[PDB]
Amino acid sequence: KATISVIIFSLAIGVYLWILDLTFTKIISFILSLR
């Protein structure tokens, strides 16, 4: 049903978390690491 596409979306949304998460760790560590 709609749900099937919802699941595909769920994976997609998750991709964002993985991707965004990477940014956080990256930038955040940047402040600590550099300075």
Partner: protein, 406 residues
């Protein structure tokens, strides 16, 4: 493609959110980083805090208004003015209310944590500077602001709870990345990823409960402030009918679940924390406690949430229920009709949600895993996820009609 770019807003809040959060966790002075149970969890009182005080004041804010209005409906002239008038006034009250409560949590968490926690860089020079007490109170109150300020803005683009879901996105994200999920098992914990497929099965189940146990009646009045109101006999042809009933709200299981965590928490860290193995209060008592989740969240919430008052406004503005056979009897008798449906459907809801926590519980018969991390976090992650779907649903589809195509 699938994206059909249009929403100017979509990426905007998303990217913006990532920036604010990374700094938020790493934050100097706090950044205590963590819930799992006892060891994995953490906190002075028992609040898993990704960061010092912010999600906590959120829950606090929500709960403050929730229970207060619940047990005592009208302390002072504001049940609901007209819904809006009553609501805005209510929300303003909520803002200040949660704010102060956050402060209380501020000093307390500050004291216990700074003094004796697993590796903490925190230096101590007297109360170094303005005390980790006064100084942490600073980061705690001020901290409450940077998150709160962030949350509101988040509320503009993402959501009031978008911020929460992000928290889930991160935590939920942390483990699948395989940060540290390769360890204890009978030479396993790395095979049987069927578990991934099975969890997927869990996702499908979740969508089912929330369609709402749904159903409704008829009639429409409208009163403009003034002398009169109108009525209409019949006319118009169209599909679409009324739907009133509902399913449990967003994180109910978590609310009830936390209550369980309270006795269990005491048992894992008593003075000179005795991890009572004989009485393992991590898991063993769990069956009893879990049922406790059922009674408190399901039953009590449903009563107030169901808003006992409903038959009044309904029966009052001329209504005869519609659902599963033509409706009839008005008055209190109808509350009867509804009462049966609400508690009944709730039993159904209990079956699924409880099945969630239960699900790792059911599977873990043959080869158990010490790596529980998952489950609840999913219930929440999906929850906001579906919620965001709500934002797209309304936002989407512009005037389809004057498409280029005739």
């Amino acid at each position: 493609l699938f994206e059909l770019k249009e929403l100017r807003q979509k990426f905007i809040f998303t990217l913006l959110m990532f920036v604010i959060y990374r700094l938020g966790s790493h934050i100097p002075i706090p950044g205590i980083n963590f819930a799992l149970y006892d060891i994995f969890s953490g906190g002075n009182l028992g609040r898993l805090t990704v960061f010092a005080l912010g999600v906590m004041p959120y829950i606090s804010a929500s709960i403050m208004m929730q229970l207060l209005t619940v047990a005592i409906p009208s302390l002072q002239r504001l049940a609901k003015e007209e819904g809006d008038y009553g609501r805005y006034k209510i929300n303003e009250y909520t803002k200040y209310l949660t704010l102060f409560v956050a402060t209380v949590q501020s000093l307390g968490i500050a004291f216990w944590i700074r003094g004796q926690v697993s590796p903490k860089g925190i230096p101590v020079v007297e109360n170094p500077g303005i005390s980790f007490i006064l100084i942490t109170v600073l980061t705690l109150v001020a901290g409450t602001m940077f998150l709160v300020w962030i949350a509101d803005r988040i509320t503009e683009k993402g959501i009031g709870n978008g911020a929460s879901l992000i928290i889930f996105a991160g935590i939920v994200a942390n483990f699948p990345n395989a940060v540290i999920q390769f360890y204890e098992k009978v030479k396993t914990g790395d095979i049987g990823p069927l578990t991934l497929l099975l969890i997927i099965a869990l996702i499908i189940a979740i969508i089912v409960g929330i369609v709402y146990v749904q159903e409704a009646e008829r009639r429409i009045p409208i009163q403009y402030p003034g002398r009169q109101v109108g009525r209409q006999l019949y006319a118009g042809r169209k599909t679409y009918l009324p739907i009133k009933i509902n399913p449990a709200g967003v994180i109910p299981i978590i609310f009830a679940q936390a209550l369980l965590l309270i006795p269990s928490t005491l048992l894992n860290f008593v003075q000179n924390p005795f991890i009572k193995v004989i009485a393992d209060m991590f898991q063993p008592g769990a069956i009893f406690y879990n049922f406790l989740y059922v009674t408190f969240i399901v039953f009590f919430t449903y009563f107030y949430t169901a808003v006992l008052i409903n038959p009044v406004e309904l029966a009052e503005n001329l209504h005869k229920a519609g659902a599963f056979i033509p409706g009839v009897r008005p008055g209190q008798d109808t509350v009867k009709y509804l009462e049966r449906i609400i508690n009944r459907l709730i039993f159904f809801g209990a079956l699924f949600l409880s099945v969630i926590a239960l699900i790792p519980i059911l599977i873990s018969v043959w080869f158990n895993i010490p790596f529980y991390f998952g489950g609840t976090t999913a219930l929440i992650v999906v929850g906001v996820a579906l919620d965001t779907f709500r934002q797209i649903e309304t936002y989407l589809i512009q005037k389809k009609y004057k498409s280029y195509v005739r």
